[PDB]
Design an enzyme around this catalytic site. Structure first.
Site, PDB file in Angstrom:
ATOM      1  N   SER A  82       0.566  -1.126  -0.190  1.00  0.00           N
ATOM      2  CA  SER A  82      -0.009   0.116  -0.479  1.00  0.00           C
ATOM      3  C   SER A  82       0.807   1.441   0.063  1.00  0.00           C
ATOM      4  CB  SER A  82      -0.629  -0.196   1.302  1.00  0.00           C
ATOM      5  OG  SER A  82      -1.313   0.810   1.379  1.00  0.00           O
ATOM      6  N   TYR A  91      -4.269   0.315   9.700  1.00  0.00           N
ATOM      7  CA  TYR A  91      -4.047   0.021   8.076  1.00  0.00           C
ATOM      8  C   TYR A  91      -2.615   0.551   8.054  1.00  0.00           C
ATOM      9  CZ  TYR A  91      -4.479  -0.247   3.429  1.00  0.00           C
ATOM     10  OH  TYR A  91      -4.569  -0.272   1.586  1.00  0.00           O
TER      11      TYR A  91
END
Lengths: 248, 248, 248, 241
Positions: free
Chosen positions: A140, A153
Site C-alpha cells: 500500500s 492500516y
C-alpha cells in the site's frame, strides 16, 4: 506454473487472478464468500479455458491456511507463485475509538495472513523440485505515508514491507524471490472509497483520482514473468494525481 | 510517441531504446561516441524498422542539451517520454583519494545531466499540445545502500531519488509524470560473463549474480505504457541473490 | 576535543558552535563574511572562555578547504568532530527557470563542500593518534519530502543521505562515525517572528510553525557526546505542527 | 511531569525509567513479573527521591491496558509522556518453523501493546488541561534492515514505523507529539549475520539510549524528534548483506 492469489474473488485480487490465468498459470484463489469465489472462478476459467480453483479460506486461521496449502499441493504438487493480497480496512475512526475487535481483524487479515501463507509457501518451495518460487506481497501507499485516522492500516502495511525484506533475505539461498507492490488508488468503479471520499492531511474528506485495476494486474504479471534470478523487490504504482509526494 | 533516451547507445540504455522502438515509439538516443551511437541506431533501426535517431551530446553541457532539445522539437515537435539513463560509475578509490576532477565529473554525469534534461522536458511538455509526458529516471540500488568506496556514486544516485520526487510533485498539475527505476546488477551477456569483481561490505572483492538487460527494458516499457493518469513512482529491479536486503 | 563547524557564523551553525564551545570544545567556525564570522567567534568565546577560531573560507573551493584543514592541523593538531553545516536554499523558482549558475551554486554549496571537508576529516582522523573522530552532516526535511519548486535543494539534501551512508560505511574500520540530522523549520527568534511564507504542496504560500535553534544545537551536542563506538546515524528534529508526515 | 514506561522493569526500559526518574519525572513502569517490577521501582526511587510506581500489566491485554491507564489517571490526573518500550523477540528459527503462539506473542508484545497504550494516551492527553503530551516509540534497527530468520520481529518493528507516522499525524492538532527511536545492539553472545554465520557484534550501553530518550522528551510539545537511530557504530547495517 501454479499460482495462488489470496483474496482473489473480488477487486484487485480478482484482476490479478484473471490476468495470471490468461498467461497460462493454473490459479487458486481464496476468499470467505463461497458464492463470490465460485462465481469468479467460473468466469475466469470461463474466459481463459485454464484451471481456476476456488478455496474458501480465512487466512487469519492457521488450520484453514494449512488446509488450503495441503489442497494446492494435493492437486498441483508445487507452488510457483504466491500473491499475498487478502486485506481489509478499518473505518477512518479516531485512533482511540478503534475497537479491539477492529484491531484484531486488521492485524489478522493484513499481516498474520500474509505471514502464514509465506510459511506454507516456504515449506512447499523448499521441498519441491525444481526448488523455489516467488512471493509477491500486496502492500500500500500507506506503507510510506498515512492518511489521518489510519494507524491500524498504516501499521499493518508498514509491517508488510518488513515481511517482504525478511522473506527476500531468508529465501535468497533457496531460489525463493519476494517482492512488494504498493498500490495507489486502484478501483473497479466509483463505488470505491476514493470516489466516495477519503481523508486528506488537513482532516477533510475529498474524492481522489483512481487507476483501473487492470494496470496493477499488468504490473504483477510482469513481476511474476521474471525468472527466479531476477526480482522486483518493490514497486509503487499509483494514480498520478493523488496526494503523496508533497508534504502534508 | 516520441522517446528520448540519454546514454542510449550502450548497455541498459541501448536495451531500453530497442524495446521502446519495438513498441512503435520514435526513439532518439544520445552519447559521446559517434561510431558506437550510429552503429546502435542502425541496428535497432533495422530490427524494428522505426525512426531511431542518434545525437552525440554531452548532457552535462547546457548548450548541447539545448541543441539536443531544439533538434527533437524541430523534427518531432513534441516529446512524450524522457529516460534519464546517461550516467557512469567510477573505479572505487578510498574516499579521501577521489580527485576534484573525478568528483566534478561524476556529479555532472550522474546528476546535472539528468537535471538539465528534466528542465527541457518540462519546458517542452508544458508547452506542447496535447500537453504532458512521462520522465523516467534511472537511479540505482546505490540510491538505497552503498558499496564501500562509493561516496560520490552513492551521493548522486541518492540525489536522483530527490530529483524524481521534486519532478513528480512539480509536474503533477501539468500531466507530467516522473518515476525512478533502481537497477541491481543488470548486465549484457558479454559483460556478465566477464565475472567482474566488485567490492563487498567487508571490503573483499567478489563477482556477483546479474540479470539480463532485457528485464530492465521490459520494466521501462511497462512504466512508459501506462496512461498519464497512472505512474510507477519507483521500482527496484534486481539480481535476486546479490547482497542488498541484509545487513552489511 | 577539537570541533569544526562549517558555516558556523550564523543561524543553526552558529547555534551549534555556541553549544559545543559551552561544552568545552575548541571550535573552528567557517564562513564567507569576515565581519560576521569574526564577531560571532568573539561573542561565543566571550560567554564560554574557550577558543573559538574564525576562518573565512569557501568550502566549495578545494584549495581553500585544504588551507582550512591545514590551519586546523597547525593549531590543534587533531580533529575530533566535523559538522558539515554550510549550505543554502535557493529562493524557489519554477523547475525549468533554474539557471545553470544557480544549479552549480546549490550543488557546490549543499553537496560539494560537505564532501571536500569529509575528505580532509578522513585524512586527519585516520592519521592522528588515537585515530578516529565524528562527522555530523546537516541534511534536511527535504531529504525526505520536497516543497514544490525545489528540485535542486531536494536533490542536494537527498544526496547528503547518500554521503552519510558511504561515510559511515567507509569510516567503520577507522573509528570514524558518521551521522545526519534532518532539520524541520528551525529558526532564530528573529527570523521566526517574521512569519515568512513558504510553498505548500498545493502551491499556496503560508508561514509554518518553527522551533528554536537551541534544540538543534542540543541535539548535536548529544550526537557528539557519544564515545566513537556509539552513533546517532540519523535523527529528524522538526516543528511538531509543520506539514511533513501526511500526504501532499 | 508524569511519565509511563512499558517494560520499565528490566533492560532498556528500566534504564529509561531510571533516567527519567532522575530528570524529575514521576514514573510508572509496567511488567508481568511483580517481584522484579517492585524491586526495580524501589531501586530507582531510592536513587532519585522521586515517585516510581509499579503496575503489573501485560500490554497485549486491552483490559489490563485500560486498567493501567485508569490507575495513572487516578493518581496523577494526567500523563505527559508515554514510552512504548515493551517488546520481545522470537528465536532465529527458520521462517516456516516459527510457531503460531510465537507469532501471536510477538505481535501482541511489539505492535498491539504499543497501539493499545497509544490509544489510552490519546484519550487522556486530549482530555487533560493543559492538553497534549508526547509518545516515544521504541522501534529497532529491524525497522530498516533484517537479520536472517527474523520475519516476525522485522515485521512488527516495521509496523512500529507505521504506527509512529500515523500517531504523529493524528496527534498534530491536539498538541500530541510522537517520535520513534531505533536502537542498534543495546547491551542488556553471537548473532546471525547476513550470510547465516553466527558472530558477535559491538553493542552500546543502555545509558546512551536513555540519554537519547531523555533528550527527546526534554523538548516542548511544539518540537519533536520524529525518528532517530542510535547504534553501536561498528555493527553491520549500512552496507549490503
Amino acid at each position: 506454473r501454479i499460482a495462488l492469489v489470496t483474496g482473489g474473488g473480488t477487486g484487485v485480487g480478482r484482476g490479478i487472478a484473471q490476468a495470471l490465468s490468461a498467461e497460462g498459470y493454473s490459479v487458486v484463489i481464496t476468499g470467505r464468500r463461497p458464492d463470490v469465489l465460485d462465481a469468479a472462478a467460473g468466469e475466469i476459467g470461463g474466459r481463459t479455458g485454464n484451471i481456476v480453483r476456488a478455496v474458501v479460506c480465512d487466512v487469519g486461521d492457521p488450520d484453514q491456511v494449512a488446509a488450503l496449502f495441503a489442497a494446492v499441493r494435493a492437486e498441483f504438487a508445487r507452488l510457483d507463485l504466491l500473491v499475498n493480497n487478502a486485506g481489509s480496512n478499518v473505518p477512518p475512526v479516531p485512533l482511540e475509538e478503534v475497537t479491539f475487535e477492529q484491531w484484531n481483524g486488521i492485524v489478522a487479515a493484513n499481516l498474520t495472513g500474509a505471514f502464514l501463507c509465506t510459511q506454507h509457501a516456504f515449506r512447499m518451495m523448499k521441498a519441491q523440485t525444481p526448488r523455489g518460487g516467488r512471493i509477491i506481497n500486496n502492500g500500500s501507499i500507506s506503507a510510506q505515508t498515512p492518511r489521518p485516522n489510519s494507524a491500524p492500516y498504516t501499521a499493518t502495511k508498514h509491517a508488510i514491507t518488513g515481511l517482504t525484506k525478511s522473506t527476500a533475505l531468508d529465501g535468497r539461498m533457496h531460489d525463493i524471490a519476494c517482492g512488494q507492490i504498493d498500490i495507489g488508488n486502484a478501483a473497479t468503479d466509483m463505488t470505491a472509497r476514493m470516489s466516495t471520499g477519503v481523508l486528506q492531511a488537513n482532516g477533510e474528506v475529498a474524492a481522489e483520482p483512481t487507476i483501473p485495476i487492470e494496470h496493477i494486474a499488468e504490473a504483477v504479471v510482469y513481476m511474476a514473468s521474471l525468472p527466479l534470478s531476477a526480482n522486483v523487490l518493490t514497486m509503487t504504482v499509483m494514480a498520478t494525481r493523488m496526494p503523496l509526494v508533497g508534504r502534508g
